């Protein structure tokens, strides 16, 4: 609001002060004859400031003006030694401009003068922000190794630019090459960068984490850089032996999984909302990982756990339908004619025939709630709240049973209300076991995509309509009988009744023995037109949600839900029944890591 | 599970023992100077085993290492004479590796040494399995004639490789060339293989069946190899005479049909689930066969049989609606107020007016059931069970009538229940006569595609929803009156009632004279949202089932159902009314087979 508009202010003030002190104006157009006229007999003072603390050398480098800066290096060889003093432009020497603008003659002249290749241009513009247009680190070597100027890249090593370098965010240049969409050339440059860290490795430069602890090979799967991920894969791809079209190939599998422990590339994939990060699973040393990890013992241990949940709900369900119910004991229908009721038992002890069996059955159900809340608090508190899905329901289903337990031994009336919420949530929570079922799996996702996405953009469009016609009909039938044609007696009944007409489930107000008021004959006629078109416009809106999403976009989501389930079962379930996949370096001393072998065909 | 994971174990053990005994390690990298250092003064023992019983000659052939094996043939010319002794690799000599890896210098050197060209590499890897990646028979000639090395193919005949050869599955190489997707070159090779069986034919090599009795021309229609099928067609394509664009052409038609007898290419097409095998009917000596066989006397004998089934059902239907019914004889409504009833006749004999006519009409219907079960037991027992369709119903419709006959002369009460199942199955079983009707034919298939395919993936999604809300409403209306607002009195009524709201057929619970409990006002409001969206998501799921299937994919299925009906009518109906198509070699002595003439145009 007030900030990015202020960024325009110095930009004009940069160009306002270029009219003042016209040696900058000569530096704009590389007008060196005026630069003779302002320095060859004027002499001493040239250290001119500006908007971002910029210099005449900075401006004469800001455009590709070699000949003016050729004078300026001869005139003032200390403008190199000073950076930009600003907040938006902090630490940027003229080298960073000369690097980023491909001026090979000037950079080589600046390095002939001698410029700090380790300078950190830490201006607030240069921070890794989604509103800033670019981000290329701190050091000019990072600015060298992002624009394609491999000659400067070779030249900066000749003047000692450390490949081992960190930005504000703990990244090397290797992380930053992931962070550009212009990936058509940096893979060629990716080979160039590792060529100049061939001497002193000490971890061979790939095991650098960032500020938050992320190696670049793990970062590229997070960032979804597919092409970088493949040339990265060449390091760890150990071919066993070829056989015509058959290529028996082994993978190192060091960090693609790590079996829990919060730093695992499979765990790092399904945490983000980035759509491009999902397609890392299309790669053959990853899809073969998740297939064998799920088909061998990921699917059946899921489906066995699928069965025990159903027997939990039915045990819950039968104990709900057999509640103890006193007949009436509240005297009669003392509120007139709308007060049908039947009481419940308060504190009469549980009798033995078919009722302690109801009691021990609830004791099956009450321990099933608390075991969830002991195992799902490391599913929420692990990641703050950030849970936006079906784990929202299993904690909510567990809440309602405890409320029913609170209604036990206190004997308040409102126990049916959490029990009614428990059943619709308990039976809808076995939708989560439609993930790993091939016959109806991808249909399950198209439900939940329209829950938070499409229902939410329609409930406002229903509430804008239902609030009129229910209120309209209430004015009409305010002066009527609730006995005959009593399709609402009061106002909030009319909202629920009009809902029962807008969704076209109930016939509606029609009593032919009497005369309806004619405004009902008009408004409801106008209502049903709107109801039958807002219904179809929604179904139209469903079509645009699926014509695009059937184009091989819903299948991969179902594959993703296989993995995200499999990751949690790998994470939450103990190491007595979940063995480590792959084959380690014990009994085959090759690299000590768990190895996976993939055999392929070429056609 | 435990098996394919074990396949990785020897592969490492193959590469574990290559570090041990480093003459294998020299053979890996073709390091012959070490092979001088381990044989030229060591001498005697070189017969080294390994994982799959492999040799040093096997490993030095496993990579294209000519010069090491050049020493090895000079050093140990008995490694050729031994194969691999393993289970996974049984009978594989080094020739099979040298053949499959295009090493023309080495194979010619091995055959100069002299290797068995008739060796059968019968390892369990090499079996025709869908989990194994390749399958090229037993003999190296089969390995020669699949990879494109026609020079070795010519070379193996020079050392006497029999074209007349059988694998474990009774196949020659001609069957195996069908079994590769890489068909871009083997048709050229298909001419090459028949060139070297030009001398001694005795059936000219094409009439070889497999282990189960399948000739390759019949196999290619089964395997759906379209391109092989066309060059196969050239053998039997006898051109009569051309006329400008008109090309009068005759086909041999020997085995494309065989009129019953369980070995018939038309019968062999519509038995499989292979989608590619359906497109063999697109070929012009096949589509012209089925058109004339169905239009001349396949369609009208179907439609005449269509009419007799309808008169069977209506004769069944009128005899059902005229059951003999005693008035009440069970005394009154002794169970209170929900026991309306009317009795049936037990053993009072059939009176003559309009009732023996009912009796002889059932005698029309009871003989119609048993004639089906005498003619459909060679439709099930012929093929085990394997019936997954409409022949499932005609055996089930026949069952219910026999149960009704069992209810006759025993006078049990539950006769309405098989009779009610009989009517809905009897009237839906005349959907089978919508196959051969052009105006609504392809619409009939889109029904049955969604029965076992799309209904089944939705009934779980209904049962997951209906089990909550019916059980939810039952808790609500457990403490209520079944007299007023009695939309279920007990629990299983609520399941059928909520079904009668989820499909949005009945208005629902609404009694305005009383006060509904407010949790009904919330849950049913939440229910109808879910009901009106799960309905639309299903209709969304219908759209992805037909946007792809309208793209010229439903029409050919309707053509397939024409043929599969026509094949059964050719098979099940006798040779007095179903004459053999084509024209035999009697009165035109050409080849004795039934000949079909096709005239075509070129544009």
PDB file of C-alpha atoms in Angstrom, chain A residues 240-246 250 296 317-318 320-323 325 337-343 416-417 419-421 423-424 427-428 430-431 438-444 446-447 450-451 454-455 482-483 486-489 493 496-497 499-500 503-507 535 538-539 542-543 546-547 550 583 587-590 597 599-601 603, chain B residues 1 4-5 7-16 19 62-63 89 92 96-97 100-101 126 133-134 136 182 453 456-458 460-461 463-465 467-469 471-472 474-476 478-481 491 504 506-510 512-515 518-525 528-529 532-534 536-541 543-544 547:
ATOM      1  CA  UNK A 240      24.164 -52.434 -13.042  1.00  0.00           C
ATOM      2  CA  UNK A 241      24.215 -54.062 -16.492  1.00  0.00           C
ATOM      3  CA  UNK A 242      22.417 -53.602 -19.796  1.00  0.00           C
ATOM      4  CA  UNK A 243      20.759 -56.384 -21.781  1.00  0.00           C
ATOM      5  CA  UNK A 244      19.573 -55.356 -25.226  1.00  0.00           C
ATOM      6  CA  UNK A 245      16.678 -53.072 -24.359  1.00  0.00           C
ATOM      7  CA  UNK A 246      16.894 -54.125 -20.710  1.00  0.00           C
ATOM      8  CA  UNK A 250      20.450 -49.035  -9.245  1.00  0.00           C
ATOM      9  CA  UNK A 296       3.928 -54.721  -1.046  1.00  0.00           C
ATOM     10  CA  UNK A 317     -23.778 -47.020  16.056  1.00  0.00           C
ATOM     11  CA  UNK A 318     -25.516 -49.891  17.851  1.00  0.00           C
ATOM     12  CA  UNK A 320     -26.320 -45.130  20.043  1.00  0.00           C
ATOM     13  CA  UNK A 321     -29.557 -46.741  18.862  1.00  0.00           C
ATOM     14  CA  UNK A 322     -30.007 -48.498  22.221  1.00  0.00           C
ATOM     15  CA  UNK A 323     -30.082 -45.494  24.549  1.00  0.00           C
ATOM     16  CA  UNK A 325     -35.216 -43.973  27.556  1.00  0.00           C
ATOM     17  CA  UNK A 337     -50.083 -29.600  20.612  1.00  0.00           C
ATOM     18  CA  UNK A 338     -46.475 -29.431  19.449  1.00  0.00           C
ATOM     19  CA  UNK A 339     -44.691 -31.149  22.311  1.00  0.00           C
ATOM     20  CA  UNK A 340     -44.414 -34.853  21.578  1.00  0.00           C
ATOM     21  CA  UNK A 341     -41.645 -36.250  23.723  1.00  0.00           C
ATOM     22  CA  UNK A 342     -40.081 -39.295  25.378  1.00  0.00           C
ATOM     23  CA  UNK A 343     -37.696 -39.064  28.318  1.00  0.00           C
ATOM     24  CA  UNK A 416     -28.625 -36.141  21.258  1.00  0.00           C
ATOM     25  CA  UNK A 417     -27.060 -33.109  19.594  1.00  0.00           C
ATOM     26  CA  UNK A 419     -24.485 -37.800  19.183  1.00  0.00           C
ATOM     27  CA  UNK A 420     -26.241 -36.689  16.017  1.00  0.00           C
ATOM     28  CA  UNK A 421     -23.145 -34.788  14.906  1.00  0.00           C
ATOM     29  CA  UNK A 423     -22.894 -40.171  13.466  1.00  0.00           C
ATOM     30  CA  UNK A 424     -22.838 -38.039  10.336  1.00  0.00           C
ATOM     31  CA  UNK A 427     -19.892 -42.396   8.857  1.00  0.00           C
ATOM     32  CA  UNK A 428     -18.479 -39.748   6.580  1.00  0.00           C
ATOM     33  CA  UNK A 430     -14.762 -43.691   6.392  1.00  0.00           C
ATOM     34  CA  UNK A 431     -14.607 -41.803   3.106  1.00  0.00           C
ATOM     35  CA  UNK A 438      -8.731 -48.303  -7.392  1.00  0.00           C
ATOM     36  CA  UNK A 439     -12.351 -48.604  -8.514  1.00  0.00           C
ATOM     37  CA  UNK A 440     -13.656 -45.368  -6.957  1.00  0.00           C
ATOM     38  CA  UNK A 441     -10.502 -43.535  -5.854  1.00  0.00           C
ATOM     39  CA  UNK A 442     -10.308 -40.549  -8.235  1.00  0.00           C
ATOM     40  CA  UNK A 443     -14.043 -39.962  -7.808  1.00  0.00           C
ATOM     41  CA  UNK A 444     -13.462 -39.270  -4.113  1.00  0.00           C
ATOM     42  CA  UNK A 446     -13.748 -34.550  -7.051  1.00  0.00           C
ATOM     43  CA  UNK A 447     -16.017 -34.456  -4.012  1.00  0.00           C
ATOM     44  CA  UNK A 450     -15.984 -28.981  -4.746  1.00  0.00           C
ATOM     45  CA  UNK A 451     -16.519 -28.769  -0.982  1.00  0.00           C
ATOM     46  CA  UNK A 454     -17.368 -24.891  -5.341  1.00  0.00           C
ATOM     47  CA  UNK A 455     -19.909 -25.173  -2.522  1.00  0.00           C
ATOM     48  CA  UNK A 482     -50.668 -21.904  10.361  1.00  0.00           C
ATOM     49  CA  UNK A 483     -53.374 -24.564  10.677  1.00  0.00           C
ATOM     50  CA  UNK A 486     -49.137 -23.642   7.492  1.00  0.00           C
ATOM     51  CA  UNK A 487     -45.922 -24.188   5.546  1.00  0.00           C
ATOM     52  CA  UNK A 488     -44.339 -21.855   8.056  1.00  0.00           C
ATOM     53  CA  UNK A 489     -45.899 -20.479  11.207  1.00  0.00           C
ATOM     54  CA  UNK A 493     -39.372 -21.861   9.679  1.00  0.00           C
ATOM     55  CA  UNK A 496     -35.876 -23.750   6.229  1.00  0.00           C
ATOM     56  CA  UNK A 497     -39.081 -24.220   4.241  1.00  0.00           C
ATOM     57  CA  UNK A 499     -34.668 -24.134   1.394  1.00  0.00           C
ATOM     58  CA  UNK A 500     -36.983 -27.120   1.131  1.00  0.00           C
ATOM     59  CA  UNK A 503     -33.561 -27.486  -3.577  1.00  0.00           C
ATOM     60  CA  UNK A 504     -36.887 -28.797  -4.972  1.00  0.00           C
ATOM     61  CA  UNK A 505     -37.551 -31.536  -2.446  1.00  0.00           C
ATOM     62  CA  UNK A 506     -40.989 -30.648  -1.023  1.00  0.00           C
ATOM     63  CA  UNK A 507     -44.109 -29.938  -3.108  1.00  0.00           C
ATOM     64  CA  UNK A 535     -29.659 -25.093 -10.043  1.00  0.00           C
ATOM     65  CA  UNK A 538     -24.442 -24.524 -10.711  1.00  0.00           C
ATOM     66  CA  UNK A 539     -24.401 -27.690 -12.801  1.00  0.00           C
ATOM     67  CA  UNK A 542     -19.626 -28.082 -12.343  1.00  0.00           C
ATOM     68  CA  UNK A 543     -18.828 -28.721 -16.012  1.00  0.00           C
ATOM     69  CA  UNK A 546     -14.240 -31.091 -14.765  1.00  0.00           C
ATOM     70  CA  UNK A 547     -13.765 -30.637 -18.523  1.00  0.00           C
ATOM     71  CA  UNK A 550     -10.438 -34.764 -16.735  1.00  0.00           C
ATOM     72  CA  UNK A 583      18.908 -52.731   0.256  1.00  0.00           C
ATOM     73  CA  UNK A 587      26.397 -57.849   2.895  1.00  0.00           C
ATOM     74  CA  UNK A 588      27.047 -55.834  -0.295  1.00  0.00           C
ATOM     75  CA  UNK A 589      29.562 -53.176   0.586  1.00  0.00           C
ATOM     76  CA  UNK A 590      28.936 -50.572  -2.081  1.00  0.00           C
ATOM     77  CA  UNK A 597      17.208 -51.501  -8.413  1.00  0.00           C
ATOM     78  CA  UNK A 599      15.114 -52.437 -14.698  1.00  0.00           C
ATOM     79  CA  UNK A 600      13.767 -50.651 -17.766  1.00  0.00           C
ATOM     80  CA  UNK A 601      13.138 -51.017 -21.473  1.00  0.00           C
ATOM     81  CA  UNK A 603      11.804 -49.081 -27.530  1.00  0.00           C
TER      82      UNK A 603
ATOM     83  CA  UNK B   1       5.900 -60.198  -2.698  1.00  0.00           C
ATOM     84  CA  UNK B   4      10.518 -60.459  -7.192  1.00  0.00           C
ATOM     85  CA  UNK B   5      12.352 -58.889  -4.255  1.00  0.00           C
ATOM     86  CA  UNK B   7      15.411 -61.310  -7.903  1.00  0.00           C
ATOM     87  CA  UNK B   8      17.366 -58.293  -6.706  1.00  0.00           C
ATOM     88  CA  UNK B   9      19.393 -60.503  -4.381  1.00  0.00           C
ATOM     89  CA  UNK B  10      21.290 -62.509  -6.973  1.00  0.00           C
ATOM     90  CA  UNK B  11      21.785 -59.385  -9.100  1.00  0.00           C
ATOM     91  CA  UNK B  12      23.761 -57.894  -6.258  1.00  0.00           C
ATOM     92  CA  UNK B  13      25.348 -61.294  -5.643  1.00  0.00           C
ATOM     93  CA  UNK B  14      26.292 -61.340  -9.312  1.00  0.00           C
ATOM     94  CA  UNK B  15      27.917 -57.964  -8.796  1.00  0.00           C
ATOM     95  CA  UNK B  16      29.258 -58.884  -5.370  1.00  0.00           C
ATOM     96  CA  UNK B  19      34.817 -57.951  -7.076  1.00  0.00           C
ATOM     97  CA  UNK B  62      27.516 -59.848 -20.904  1.00  0.00           C
ATOM     98  CA  UNK B  63      29.242 -56.656 -21.916  1.00  0.00           C
ATOM     99  CA  UNK B  89      18.911 -68.568 -16.082  1.00  0.00           C
ATOM    100  CA  UNK B  92      21.419 -69.796 -21.515  1.00  0.00           C
ATOM    101  CA  UNK B  96      22.199 -66.062 -26.306  1.00  0.00           C
ATOM    102  CA  UNK B  97      23.865 -63.010 -24.811  1.00  0.00           C
ATOM    103  CA  UNK B 100      20.840 -60.485 -28.237  1.00  0.00           C
ATOM    104  CA  UNK B 101      23.502 -57.780 -27.993  1.00  0.00           C
ATOM    105  CA  UNK B 126      12.669 -66.269 -19.772  1.00  0.00           C
ATOM    106  CA  UNK B 133       9.812 -57.511 -19.477  1.00  0.00           C
ATOM    107  CA  UNK B 134      10.602 -59.568 -22.595  1.00  0.00           C
ATOM    108  CA  UNK B 136      11.880 -64.323 -27.063  1.00  0.00           C
ATOM    109  CA  UNK B 182       8.071 -53.121 -32.087  1.00  0.00           C
ATOM    110  CA  UNK B 453     -18.320 -49.883 -13.967  1.00  0.00           C
ATOM    111  CA  UNK B 456     -20.346 -49.977  -8.458  1.00  0.00           C
ATOM    112  CA  UNK B 457     -18.072 -47.009  -7.922  1.00  0.00           C
ATOM    113  CA  UNK B 458     -21.041 -44.994  -6.626  1.00  0.00           C
ATOM    114  CA  UNK B 460     -20.133 -47.245  -1.888  1.00  0.00           C
ATOM    115  CA  UNK B 461     -20.358 -43.467  -2.066  1.00  0.00           C
ATOM    116  CA  UNK B 463     -23.711 -46.214   1.479  1.00  0.00           C
ATOM    117  CA  UNK B 464     -21.102 -44.040   3.165  1.00  0.00           C
ATOM    118  CA  UNK B 465     -23.636 -41.200   3.262  1.00  0.00           C
ATOM    119  CA  UNK B 467     -25.592 -44.824   6.855  1.00  0.00           C
ATOM    120  CA  UNK B 468     -24.966 -41.584   8.687  1.00  0.00           C
ATOM    121  CA  UNK B 469     -28.075 -39.541   8.078  1.00  0.00           C
ATOM    122  CA  UNK B 471     -28.844 -43.355  11.682  1.00  0.00           C
ATOM    123  CA  UNK B 472     -28.650 -39.677  12.592  1.00  0.00           C
ATOM    124  CA  UNK B 474     -33.150 -42.336  13.914  1.00  0.00           C
ATOM    125  CA  UNK B 475     -31.521 -40.940  17.044  1.00  0.00           C
ATOM    126  CA  UNK B 476     -33.553 -37.774  16.542  1.00  0.00           C
ATOM    127  CA  UNK B 478     -36.292 -42.247  18.500  1.00  0.00           C
ATOM    128  CA  UNK B 479     -38.011 -39.972  21.021  1.00  0.00           C
ATOM    129  CA  UNK B 480     -40.970 -39.168  18.777  1.00  0.00           C
ATOM    130  CA  UNK B 481     -44.325 -40.365  17.490  1.00  0.00           C
ATOM    131  CA  UNK B 491     -34.326 -48.146  12.268  1.00  0.00           C
ATOM    132  CA  UNK B 504     -34.960 -36.887  -4.026  1.00  0.00           C
ATOM    133  CA  UNK B 506     -40.273 -38.125  -1.564  1.00  0.00           C
ATOM    134  CA  UNK B 507     -40.948 -34.715   0.016  1.00  0.00           C
ATOM    135  CA  UNK B 508     -39.665 -35.671   3.435  1.00  0.00           C
ATOM    136  CA  UNK B 509     -40.524 -35.111   7.067  1.00  0.00           C
ATOM    137  CA  UNK B 510     -42.669 -31.998   7.290  1.00  0.00           C
ATOM    138  CA  UNK B 512     -46.379 -28.095  10.346  1.00  0.00           C
ATOM    139  CA  UNK B 513     -48.979 -28.581  13.075  1.00  0.00           C
ATOM    140  CA  UNK B 514     -46.290 -29.790  15.475  1.00  0.00           C
ATOM    141  CA  UNK B 515     -42.788 -28.582  16.276  1.00  0.00           C
ATOM    142  CA  UNK B 518     -34.295 -28.451  15.695  1.00  0.00           C
ATOM    143  CA  UNK B 519     -31.567 -30.961  14.931  1.00  0.00           C
ATOM    144  CA  UNK B 520     -33.757 -32.190  12.087  1.00  0.00           C
ATOM    145  CA  UNK B 521     -33.818 -28.577  10.937  1.00  0.00           C
ATOM    146  CA  UNK B 522     -30.012 -28.577  10.810  1.00  0.00           C
ATOM    147  CA  UNK B 523     -29.035 -32.059   9.694  1.00  0.00           C
ATOM    148  CA  UNK B 524     -31.603 -32.383   6.909  1.00  0.00           C
ATOM    149  CA  UNK B 525     -30.574 -28.934   5.746  1.00  0.00           C
ATOM    150  CA  UNK B 528     -29.935 -31.993   1.190  1.00  0.00           C
ATOM    151  CA  UNK B 529     -26.835 -29.976   0.322  1.00  0.00           C
ATOM    152  CA  UNK B 532     -27.838 -32.391  -4.317  1.00  0.00           C
ATOM    153  CA  UNK B 533     -24.064 -32.329  -4.817  1.00  0.00           C
ATOM    154  CA  UNK B 534     -23.307 -36.042  -4.714  1.00  0.00           C
ATOM    155  CA  UNK B 536     -24.270 -33.762  -9.564  1.00  0.00           C
ATOM    156  CA  UNK B 537     -20.785 -35.148  -8.952  1.00  0.00           C
ATOM    157  CA  UNK B 538     -22.106 -38.458 -10.222  1.00  0.00           C
ATOM    158  CA  UNK B 539     -23.460 -36.716 -13.309  1.00  0.00           C
ATOM    159  CA  UNK B 540     -20.063 -35.063 -13.626  1.00  0.00           C
ATOM    160  CA  UNK B 541     -18.561 -38.547 -13.428  1.00  0.00           C
ATOM    161  CA  UNK B 543     -19.479 -36.890 -18.462  1.00  0.00           C
ATOM    162  CA  UNK B 544     -15.906 -38.147 -18.287  1.00  0.00           C
ATOM    163  CA  UNK B 547     -16.685 -37.402 -23.710  1.00  0.00           C
TER     164      UNK B 547
END
